[PDB]
Amino acid sequence: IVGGTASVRGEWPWQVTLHTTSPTQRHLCGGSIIGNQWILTAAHCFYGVESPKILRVYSGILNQSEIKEDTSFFGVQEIIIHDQYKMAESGYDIALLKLETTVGYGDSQRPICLPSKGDRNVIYTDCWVTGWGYRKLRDKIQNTLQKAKIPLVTNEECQKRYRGHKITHKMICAGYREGGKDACKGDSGGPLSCKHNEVWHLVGITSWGEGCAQRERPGVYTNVVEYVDWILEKTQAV
Ligand SMILES: O=C(/C=C/c1cc(Cl)ccc1-n1cnnn1)N[C@@H](Cc1ccccc1)C(=O)Nc1ccc(C(=O)O)cc1
Helix, strand or coil: CECCEECCCCCCCCEEEEEECCCCCEEEEEEEEEECCEEEECHHHHCCCCCHHHEEEECCCCEHHHCCCCCCCEEEEEEEECCCCCCHHHCCCCEEEEECCCCCCECCECCCECCCCHHHHCCCCCEEEEECCCCCCCCCCCCECEEEECCEECHHHHHHHCCCCCCCCCEEEECCCCCCCECCCCCCCCEEEEEECCEEEEEEEEEECCCCCCCCCCEEEEEHHHHHHHHHHHHCCC
16 A cells, blocks of 8 residues: 555554465465355456465454464465456456355454445445555555545546556446555455445555556556355355
């Protein structure tokens, strides 16, 4: 996160750190708890991940230093990538992790509501992007979970900013015209959380951008409301 500040413990209890153990254990991506055995994240996080066996989901974490060999984690039973996904820049950058065990909900870890289908016509004015990603293009994974308040940008405005790309209505952009606050390397997969009527909603999944926090280059996010049917298809299968 560029231009953000340290989160407070328990502030984003749906936020998870997805680690890989191959070849060495390190933070791979962010994710969000959406159900008691479900993490919503970005499909591009799994480029070259050949097995769910190398993945570890840690919830209730503020600091990466809380993670040692004796720290409890959730094993991943299955990786579900949207079958239309080709690359982040083309959309469908969404994946679900089915966990091997159930997350016990508490003040440190709980789910975030998915947006409502009717709420596709609501203006979100209180949106935050969180993660352990870089604070600048050449940096490193941050110890403390960072947060940044970012305004949503219309599809028309985002399309003007990305000449040569196709910004679809299955994408949602966020950023200041002058830059300064954005997601960066390591934040992918994490949430873009918006508060509406005192309830937080998972509006976006951090996906891609041209560099980090540049003037007139909004961050591009998977527009979660456009995937509610797909999430239910996958999590509510009979
Ligand atoms: O986190 C981001 C999002 C970028 C982005 C999103 C918006 Cl919304 C705006 C601007 C953006 N950026 C544009 N350029 N950078 N970020 N991208 C991932 C892609 C990836 C995923 C998994 C494995 C390998 C690659 C990344 O780099 N992840 C990554 C990089 C370094 C390290 C490590 O451990 O060092 C660990 C993880």
